Every structure is written in C-alpha cells, then in structure tokens.
Design a protein around this ligand. Sequence first.
Ligand SMILES: CC(=O)N[C@@H]1[C@@H](O)[C@H](O[C@@H]2O[C@H](CO)[C@@H](O[C@@H]3O[C@H](CO)[C@@H](O[C@@H]4O[C@H](CO)[C@@H](O)[C@H](O)[C@H]4NC(C)=O)[C@H](O)[C@H]3NC(C)=O)[C@H](O)[C@H]2NC(C)=O)[C@@H](CO)O[C@H]1O
Length: 129
Amino acid sequence: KVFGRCELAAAMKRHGLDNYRGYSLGNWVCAAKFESNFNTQATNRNTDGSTDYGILQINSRWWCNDGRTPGSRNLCNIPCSALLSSDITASVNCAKKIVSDGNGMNAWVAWRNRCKGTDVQAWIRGCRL
Ligand SMILES: CC(=O)N[C@@H]1[C@@H](O)[C@H](O[C@@H]2O[C@H](CO)[C@@H](O[C@@H]3O[C@H](CO)[C@@H](O[C@@H]4O[C@H](CO)[C@@H](O)[C@H](O)[C@H]4NC(C)=O)[C@H](O)[C@H]3NC(C)=O)[C@H](O)[C@H]2NC(C)=O)[C@@H](CO)O[C@H]1O
C-alpha cells in the first residue's frame, strides 16, 4: 500500500503502541519513513543471508519463517508473508516482543542513527492525534 504523511501512522495508537513498555509512542512514528518508507510491501534480503519483510523490515533469520532461514529461531512463529498485506492488524504481536528482550530498538537500524536524538516530536506532530 501507499500511505501518506498523515494516514498510515494514526494506527500505531489503535494498537497499544502509545507509551508501551517504556518507549513513548511519540518516539515511534519517525523511524517508519526510515525502514520501508511508508510501504507495507517493501522488502529486501540481508547481505548476511536472511531476507527481511515489510515496512517493518524484519528477517526470518532470528524472527520469522520464510523457509530460507535455517538456524532460525522463528521466535515469531508465523509466516513472514503474514505481515506484508494491506492489512496489518495482527503483525504487531512480534513487534511488541522485539523490545522485550531488553534490547530496545537494538534491532531497528535506522532509528538509532536516523531517528536517535532527532526532532522526533516533529515527526508525530501535526496529524490529528
Ligand atoms: C534489509 C532489511 O529489510 N532489514 C535488515 C535487517 O535484517 C537487519 O536487522 C537486524 O538484524 C540483526 C541481526 O540479528 C538483529 O540484531 C540482534 O537482535 C538480537 C535479537 O533480536 C539481539 O540478541 C539478544 O541480546 C540480548 C542482550 O544481550 C540477549 O539477552 C539475548 O540472549 C539475545 N537474544 C537471544 C534470543 O539470544 C542482539 O542484541 C542484536 N544485535 C546486537 C549486536 O546486540 C536486529 O534485531 C535486526 N533488526 C531489523 C529490524 O532487521 C539490519 C542490520 O543492520 O539490516 C536491515 O537492512
């Protein structure tokens, strides 16, 4: 799908991301533009061999099953193709766990450097929320 500046993000809040498990949900919306650029079908492989999926940009190596990830924990226990559709309603369970390791955003590559210390309230701001 193609989601605009004010239309793909009001749904983080419909899923409990608001201020959940210590990260403020204000801090969240910026990074999305940095991982798949508001696209729920944009995916790529990893130069280390495990492909990634979604706006989420996650690989089947440590987290889900795509069948090409051996030595994969499949900690998500769901097909990786189970998130890339227009609908995204159940795709957050695993996202809701990825911060539980205590690693935080240790997984999101763009945020720690593109959205870490940025004017992020300048990212979620302006839409009605
Ligand atoms: C191309 C695209 O679309 N996406 C690419 C991504 O594939 C890639 O992303 C990151 O991939 C790395 C590789 O695994 C991953 O980092 C490691 O994540 C694990 C678990 O999530 C962490 O391990 C836990 O450590 C804790 C703390 O010490 C331990 O308690 C625990 O024992 C560990 N877990 C288990 C179950 O053993 C690591 O801490 C972490 N790396 C380090 C060095 O700490 C990220 O999760 C991936 N994130 C995403 C969103 O992909 C990215 C690489 O930069 O490239 C993208 O392009």
